[PDB]
Amino acid sequence: GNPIPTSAVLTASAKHIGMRCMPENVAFLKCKKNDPNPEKCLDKGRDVTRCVLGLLKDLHQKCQKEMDDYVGCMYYYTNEFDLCRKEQEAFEKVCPLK
Amino acid sequence: MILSVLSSLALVSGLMVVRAKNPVHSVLFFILVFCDTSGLLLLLGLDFFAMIFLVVYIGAIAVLFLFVVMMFHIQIAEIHEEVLRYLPVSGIIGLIFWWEMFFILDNESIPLLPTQRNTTSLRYTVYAGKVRSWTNLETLGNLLYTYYFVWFLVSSLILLVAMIGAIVLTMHRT
Amino acid sequence: MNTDITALEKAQYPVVDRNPAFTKVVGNFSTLDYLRFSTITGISVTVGYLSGIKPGIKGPSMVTGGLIGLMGGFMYAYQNSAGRLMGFFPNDGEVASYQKR
Amino acid sequence: RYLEEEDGPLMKTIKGSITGFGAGTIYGTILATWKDVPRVERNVALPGLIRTLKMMGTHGLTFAAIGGVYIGVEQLVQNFRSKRDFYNGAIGGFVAGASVLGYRARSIPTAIAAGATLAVTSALI
Amino acid sequence: VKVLTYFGMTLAAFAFWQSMDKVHVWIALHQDEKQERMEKEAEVRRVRAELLRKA
Amino acid sequence: MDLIKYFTFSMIIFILGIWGILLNRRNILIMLMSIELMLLAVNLNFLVFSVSLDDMMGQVFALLVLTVAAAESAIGLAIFVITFRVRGTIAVEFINSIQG
Amino acid sequence: MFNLFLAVFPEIFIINATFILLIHGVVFSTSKKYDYPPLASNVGWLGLLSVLITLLLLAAGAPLLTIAHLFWNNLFRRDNFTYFCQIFLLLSTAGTISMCFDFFDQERFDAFEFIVLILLSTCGMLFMISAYDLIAMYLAIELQSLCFYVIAASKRKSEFSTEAGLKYLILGAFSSGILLFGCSMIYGSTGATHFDQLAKILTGYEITGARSSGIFMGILFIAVGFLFKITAVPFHMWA
Amino acid sequence: PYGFWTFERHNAQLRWDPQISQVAGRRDPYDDLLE
Amino acid sequence: ASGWGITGNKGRCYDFWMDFSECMSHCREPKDCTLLREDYLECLHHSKEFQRRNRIYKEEQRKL
Amino acid sequence: MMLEFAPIFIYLVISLLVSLILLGVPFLFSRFDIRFYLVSILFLIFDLEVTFFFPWAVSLNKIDLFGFWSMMAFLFILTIGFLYEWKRGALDWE
Amino acid sequence: ALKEEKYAARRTILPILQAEEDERFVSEWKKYLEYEADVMKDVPGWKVGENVYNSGRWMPPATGELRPDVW
Ligand SMILES: CCCCCCCCCCCCCCCCCC(=O)OC[C@H](COP(=O)([O-])OCC(O)COP(=O)([O-])OC[C@@H](COC(=O)CCCCCCCCCCCCCCCCC)OC(=O)CCCCCCCCCCCCCCCCC)OC(=O)CCCCCCCCCCCCCCCCC
Ligand SMILES: CCCCCCCCCCCCCCCCCC(=O)OC[C@H](COP(=O)([O-])OCC(O)COP(=O)([O-])OC[C@@H](COC(=O)CCCCCCCCCCCCCCCCC)OC(=O)CCCCCCCCCCCCCCCCC)OC(=O)CCCCCCCCCCCCCCCCC
Ligand SMILES: C[C@@H]1CC[C@@]2(OC1)O[C@H]1C[C@H]3[C@@H]4CC=C5C[C@@H](OCCC(CO[C@H]6O[C@H](CO)[C@@H](O[C@H]7O[C@H](CO)[C@@H](O)[C@H](O)[C@H]7O)[C@H](O)[C@H]6O)CO[C@H]6O[C@H](CO)[C@@H](O[C@H]7O[C@H](CO)[C@@H](O)[C@H](O)[C@H]7O)[C@H](O)[C@H]6O)CC[C@]5(C)[C@H]4CC[C@]3(C)[C@H]1[C@@H]2C
Ligand SMILES: CCCCCCCCCCCCCCCCCC(=O)O[C@@H](COC(=O)CCCCCCCCCCCCCCC)COP(=O)(O)OC[C@H](O)CO
């Protein structure tokens, strides 16, 4: 069902995440800037987490195979983008950044 | 434990620096002390200083000492002396320094006693500082040549004095 | 590199230019600045000549003294001109030239 | 300005003898280290240590004697006479100096000098 | 020195450093008592100063 | 306990330099070596404090102190060389003519 | 940017003049054509000239030495006190140099490097006066000290001069190590080396019972180095 | 004097450091994320 | 006090330093800035934090 | 991270062991020349020059023109010293 | 440009990693506070989880290891 949000999955999806979860990300970062206390930021963190997990599930639904290949290569090369261009292009052709 | 090992090696090697009858042997032990110091520096995460201690202290300064001491061909009669009669004076001076100076940080920097509980889970991680980490080298180089450049240049003047003095005191041109 | 010309002791004369450019300071050289410059250089050349006679290098000694004097005299003239433009020294001429151009 | 103590003249004399043996041991150590070793002792270690320890003990003994007799006579003067001044303690300084330093120096001239000196110091106190 | 002599000196030094560790633990464990003694002496000194200022 | 252990390491190096001064009355080369040991201990003190305090000033000064140590050793060994050249020996009894 | 360096015009000039004299001396002292002339007196006169020009630059630019004080703050601090101290130092150096010419020519001390080392030590003492941080203070002190070590041993075939140099270098290096240790203790205890920061941290507390033994012994060691430098008893017997 | 450290000559860092507060090497890590 | 951190960011104790300095820059009595000063020094050495945690460890060793 | 230094230590231990094995298996079946001091001094100076070059070289992208010219001034002082040594014959071994 | 690509990738996933870490630390801190409340029960004058900083601004718990992050 829901992909395990490992470093490989998040790094491979980072461009989609930046384009999609930008307001939640910026809000979380502003609140962290004002207050580093983790307790006083949990709500913005939940907003960020929900946005990201929803986008992850969506991308898994749309292009399962391309996402699997890109995530696998990214994990194999420890998230080195240069060694993964072919499957990155295949993943972005079926799941556009928009 | 690892700091116990390195400190024990440093203690013995330093005693050998100050107590070896042959001065060439003293220079070699001095080199062991700098190696142990470099190990400590690696433990602190200061790899630039760890390498520079090898390059400068061992690679240049100790080499100078070794060249000079080896060509001196010192006879032990010229520098021998019994040290048994110094044990008391070293005992007071060492003790007083020991009692004062090994424990000077204790009142200001009180150690955290390690408990039978996993405190490692209370380590808080801030990923923001980890996006672009700086090496020791580039953190130092960000400062030496711009914000503190005057001290850098004064050090250059010190080296120039060393060069001039070395020539004027020892040169005998053939 | 962040810079800040602000001095500890404020200028006691009108500030014609807070941080005058190098060429502006040089172009601000007055007759008195050139007199200081020339005097320092001439004294330095004379000292070079006289001290060079005994070793037998009076010419090269004149050149060395002249280089020292040129650098010192230029630094002194620049000091005076820049201080006048910045309001640290009496600068009636600078104020008069500023109120007109 | 002086109300931080519990006193006790016997304790005063005993503790003075101990501080004096403290200070004489250190002084003898310093004296022994300053001097050279005899030429016939350059190649042998033990007698140099022995001589240093002997100097330590001798100086500890003499300085303990001064540091004990001084306070002892001082208290034995302000107890029988029952008065507090610099006169009590000047007598103690004089007797300590005279007795101990003239026993060591083997000279009546020097004793009267040492006693005189030790009084002017306790008097300046 | 002999190689074995250097190794034995190193072992003795290791024992010395572990003993020093025990000393540091002792010093840390007595911070509270030292603070209590400092506080009692500070209270005594303050009371003496206030009482002498009364005159 | 890290900071007390790092500090006592440098401290033993400093005390060893002091002892080397005390124990080497006929050997002034080792006296110079003991002085270097003290300088090394101070350099280590600056580096440890820099980490403990999270501050770079200790590191800048450590580099500059290394420069000073190098120049010091160079000039000192030159003076040793010329003293030896004049006397033909390094024994302390031939460098005691200035006194009083 | 250039105008910021008005705060260091005196020092720039004297350093550059010292370099010029070093080059002049080494080029013509080695000259076969000129038969290797002694240049101690020639370089001495030119260096006296350089010292006097430095004095002129410093004395006549009293306000300008305080320009850009924020930019220079973490490097040095120039004020009224440093102004007069540096003037007096330059005047003393000029007098000492003027007293050397008969020594140069009659003894035939031909080494012009003597004058260069004096000038570099004067640079070091100038920076000593304006130092406002433990690091800068130590560096300037060391420059000064190394120049003295070299010139104390200038009669390099003399038993007396070589003995002086050896005693000076050993005792000077020892005292400098003690002072540096004190500096390290103060930094470790306060996180600061700038004099302003040290003033703020240390003021109002002195020994308020909970005294930083680190701060107290750092001060003591620094004082020991200072007392060695001023030849105060018991740190005097080198002198 | 009373409160000498209050005198402007002694508050140099309070006026210099804000001018370099955006310099790489002394920034809060979150400033890069938001700028 | 400098603000330059060993990893290229603001030093750990620099905000405490700056609060203390800003307080002392206008308070004619340093006793008014005592709290900020002890906060700065606590950030440098963690003395009170470690002392309190050692008290906790002490009580644990006493009740066992 | 300092993680990468651990293989170096294990490598040193293994290299030492290989050395001992190779060396130990066959046990089964008054003329002071100042020019060396002078070359040591020169090496010390230029060793420190390289030392100071390293952070500068990695930091050129951030220090820009000011750092470049400050290092140039450093080099100018050291090169004046080098010229002095060259003229005085410290670089001649004949 | 290659490095900026990697560095931008790290920037977009920073908030979720930080939020996860914040939740983890808060839960662990609650557990430790309960532990301290139990241990220091019957010690008069205690205050569980007292901030040692007068300003009250939040700081991570000090660890007593000089350079833990590099190993
Ligand atoms: C269960 C496992 C069993 C299997 C494994 C067993 C492995 C074997 C055992 C290990 C080796 C031990 C034996 C060593 C070799 C002996 C054989 C031999 O032939 O020696 C010849 C040797 C002759 O010397 P040499 O090597 O031929 O060199 C001749 C010239 O000196 C050369 O000239 P030079 O120029 O090269 O050197 C100049 C000068 C060099 O000058 C010196 O080295 C100074 C000598 C005095 C050293 C002072 C202590 C130094 C050690 C540091 C200790 C901490 C210091 C802290 C001080 C700072 C604090 C303020 O030379 C000397 O003075 C030589 C003196 C050597 C004496 C060494 C004595 C060491 C002190 C031992 C104290 C023991 C106390 C125990 C508790 C300690 C407190 C914790 O004579 C001896 O027999 C002495 C060595 C035997 C004692 C030393 C070893 C002690 C080890 C104790 C065991 C560890 C206990 C702690 C365990 C902790 C567990 C948790
Ligand atoms: C997981 C780790 C596993 C480790 C496994 C390995 C464990 C080994 C345990 C060994 C202990 C038990 C020994 C049982 C007895 C063995 C039988 C035996 O002794 O016969 C051997 C026999 C001599 O035995 P002996 O009857 O005792 O005679 C002694 C003297 O003749 C007596 O004549 P003397 O009284 O006139 O003395 C003059 C002096 C000669 O003058 C000297 O100055 C001695 C040399 C010292 C300084 C030399 C190095 C500095 C010079 C620059 C070298 C290049 C620097 C850059 C390259 C290296 C840097 C990485 O001789 C000595 O003082 C020798 C003392 C040795 C101290 C230096 C060795 C300790 C280094 C630290 C080791 C750290 C790990 C071990 C500790 C671990 C924690 C406990 O022949 C040999 O040793 C074969 C020669 C080959 C030795 C190669 C060793 C390595 C050399 C290259 C590396 C240099 C740097 C050292 C490592 C640096 C690390 C960064
Ligand atoms: C070119 C020429 C050739 C010659 C040469 O150069 C020149 O060649 C050069 C080659 C050099 C060697 C190179 C390399 C080393 C290794 C180093 O040694 C690493 C030691 C460090 C790293 O050790 C661990 O680090 C991590 C744990 O920290 C481990 O990570 C785990 O833990 C993570 C967290 O859970 C998980 O997340 C991870 O997943 C999980 O894996 C990691 O695996 C492991 O490596 C430091 O560790 C310690 O430090 C601790 C703190 O002090 C101590 O803690 C203690 O004290 C505390 C209170 O203070 C109490 O609270 C604690 O309870 C209590 O235990 C304790 O002693 C110990 O841990 C020692 C120096 C040396 C030999 C150099 C010597 C000099 C040379 C020979 C040079 C030589 C000169
Ligand atoms: C072996 C090579 C020898 C080379 C010798 C020639 C060069 C020696 C150095 C001479 C000083 C600089 C001469 C170059 C002139 C051009 C300077 C320039 O271009 O201005 C730049 C500024 O250049 C400088 O200001 C640096 C000057 C270097 C310092 C030289 C020391 C002069 C005196 C210092 C006094 C301190 C006391 C000395 C202690 C011994 C503009 O930069 P910016 O303001 O736009 O931004 C700053 C930077 O880009 C960002 O970090």
Domain locations in chain F as residue ranges: 2-87
Identify whether the C-beta of residue G176 lies closer than 8 Å to the C-beta of residue G131: no
R_g of chain H computed on alpha carbons:
15
Beta bridge partners of G194: G133
Look up residue J25 and give its DSSP letter: G
User: Was domain F2-87 assigned CATH 3.10.20.30?
Assistant: no
**Of F22, G9, F56, nearest to B94 (Cα)?**
F22
How far apart, in Å, are the Cα atoms of B19 and each of B92, E1, E4, E14, G239? Answer: 19, 11, 17, 20, 30
Please state the atom number of ligand 1 nearest to the C-alpha of residue B94.
60
The span from the CA of D64 to the CA of D20, in Å, is 4
Nearest CA in chain K to I12: K59
End-to-end CA distance of chain I: 43
Look up residue I4 and give its DSSP letter: B
Q: Do the domain assignments include residue J93?
A: no
Residues of B in contact with E28 (CB under 8 A): 106, 110-111, 113
Please state the atom number of ligand 1 nearest to the C-alpha of residue B95.
60
Residues of G in contact with B168 (CB under 8 A): 111, 113, 150, 154, 156
Residues of I in contact with H4 (CB under 8 A): none
- Angle K53-K59-K64 (CA atoms, 0-180°, nearest 5)? 95
Structure tokens belonging to residue G238: 């080198």
Q: Do the domain assignments include residue J57?
A: yes
Strands (E), chain E: none
Please state the atom number of ligand 4 nearest to the C-alpha of residue G2.
25
Residues of E in contact with F8 (CB under 8 A): 20
Q: Do the domain assignments include residue J78?
A: yes
Is F90 within 8 Å of B139 when comparing Cβ atoms?
no
| Phi, psi angle pair for A24, to nearest 5° | -60, -40
> The domain that contains J34 carries what CATH number?
1.20.58.1610
The span from the CA of F67 to the CA of J49, in Å, is 10
Q: What resolution (Å)? A: 2.1
Give Cα G40 to chain centroid, integer Å: 22
Tally the C-alpha atoms within 13 A of residue B130's C-alpha that lie toward its C-beta.
12
Identify whether the C-beta of residue C44 lies closer than 8 Å to the C-beta of residue C72: yes
Is I58 within 8 Å of E29 when comparing Cβ atoms?
yes
Structure tokens belonging to residue E51: 């009482």
CB count, 10 Å around CB of G236? 11
Q: What per-residue string of b and e applies to G71-91 under the rule 16 or more CB within 10 Å gives b?
A: bbbbbbbbbeebbebbeebbe
What distance in angstroms lies between residue B33's CA and the mean position of ligand 1's atoms?
18
How far apart, in Å, are the Cα atoms of D25 and each of A52, B58, D11? Answer: 78, 42, 21
The sign of the dihedral angle between the CA atoms of B152, G225, B60, E7 is negative
| Phi, psi angle pair for G39, to nearest 5° | -120, 10
Give Cα H12 to chain centroid, integer Å: 9
Is G149 within 8 Å of B165 when comparing Cβ atoms?
yes
Sort residue D28 into left (φ over 0), alpha (ψ -120 to 50) or beta.
alpha
Identify whether the C-beta of residue B37 lies closer than 8 Å to the C-beta of residue F40: yes
Angle, helices B23-43 vs F2-23, to 10°: value is 170
Q: Do the domain assignments include residue J77?
A: yes
End-to-end CA distance of chain F: 51
The span from the CA of G188 to the CA of B105, in Å, is 9
Which bound ligand lies closest to the C-alpha atom of J9?
3
The span from the CA of I14 to the CA of H26, in Å, is 9
How far apart, in Å, are the Cα atoms of J83 and each of B169, G24, G25, J45? Answer: 18, 12, 12, 13
**Of G50, F59, J37, G166, nearest to B151 (Cα)?**
F59
The span from the CA of I52 to the CA of K40, in Å, is 11
The span from the CA of F83 to the CA of F77, in Å, is 10
Q: Do the domain assignments include residue J94?
A: no
Question: For the purposes of burial, counting CB atoms within 10 Å of the CB of C17, is it exposed (0-12), middle (13-18) or buried (19 or more)?
Answer: middle
Helix (H) or strand (E) holding A46: helix A42-62
Nearest CA in chain E to I52: E32
Q: Say if B15 is an interface residue toward chain E (CB within 8 Å).
A: yes
Structure tokens belonging to residue B36: 């142990």
The span from the CA of I13 to the CA of I61, in Å, is 33
The span from the CA of I42 to the CA of K53, in Å, is 7
G199: nearest CB among H10, H15, H16: H10
The set of protein residues with a Cβ atom below 6 angstroms from ligand 4 is: B 146, 150, 153-154, 157; C 1; G 1, 5, 8, 11-12, 15; J 63-67, 69-70, 72-73, 75-76, 79
**Among J residues 2-41, those touching chain K with beta carbons less than 8 Å apart:** 2-3
Which bound ligand lies closest to the C-alpha atom of B100?
1
**Of F88, F28, G166, nearest to B72 (Cα)?**
F88
**Of C97, G137, F43, H10, nearest to I30 (Cα)?**
H10
Residue of minimum CA distance from atom 16 in ligand 1: E5
Is B128 within 8 Å of A38 when comparing Cβ atoms?
no
Nearest CA in chain K to F5: K66
What distance in angstroms lies between residue B126's CA and the mean position of ligand 4's atoms?
38
Is A11 within 8 Å of K21 when comparing Cβ atoms?
no
DSSP chain B: -HHHHHHHHHHHHHHHHHH-SSHHHHHHHHHHHHHHHHHHHHHTT-HHHHHHIIIIIIIIIHHHHHHHHHHHT--GGGT----GGGHHHHHHHHHHHHHHHSSHHHHHS---PPPSS-GGGG----GGGGSSPPPHHHHHHHHHTTTTHHHHHHHHHHHHHHHHHHHHHH----
Domains of chain B with CATH codes:
2-169 (1.20.120.1200)
How far apart, in Å, are the Cα atoms of K65 and each of B111, B150, F5, K68? Answer: 10, 35, 11, 6
What distance in angstroms lies between residue F14's CA and the mean position of ligand 1's atoms?
22
Residue of minimum CA distance from atom 30 in ligand 1: E1
Tell whether omega for the bond before A36 is within 30 degrees of 0, i.e. cis: no
Q: Which domain holds residue J36?
A: 5-88
Identify whether the C-beta of residue G196 lies closer than 8 Å to the C-beta of residue H13: yes
Identify whether the C-beta of residue I37 lies closer than 8 Å to the C-beta of residue I29: no
Ligand 2 pocket, E1 CB below 6 A?
Answer: yes
Ligand 2 pocket, E2 CB below 6 A?
Answer: yes
Which bound ligand lies closest to the C-alpha atom of G120?
4
What distance in angstroms lies between residue E12's CA and the mean position of ligand 1's atoms?
7
**Of E48, H6, G34, nearest to I32 (Cα)?**
H6
Beta bridge partners of I10: I4
The sign of the dihedral angle between the CA atoms of E38, E40, E41, E46 is positive
Structure tokens belonging to residue A67: 């996402």
Q: Say if B126 is an interface residue toward chain H (CB within 8 Å).
A: yes
Residues of B in contact with E32 (CB under 8 A): none
Is I31 within 8 Å of G204 when comparing Cβ atoms?
yes
Chains J and D are in contact, defined as 3 or more C-beta pairs closer than 8 angstroms: no
Please state the domain count of chain J: 1
Which bound ligand lies closest to the C-alpha atom of K62?
3
Beta bridge partners of I4: I10
**Of F6, E18, B90, nearest to E10 (Cα)?**
E18
Please state the atom number of ligand 4 nearest to the C-alpha of residue J79.
1
Q: Tell me the three-class secondary structure of F68-95, residue by residue.
A: HHHHHHHHHHHHHHHHHHHHCCCCHHHC
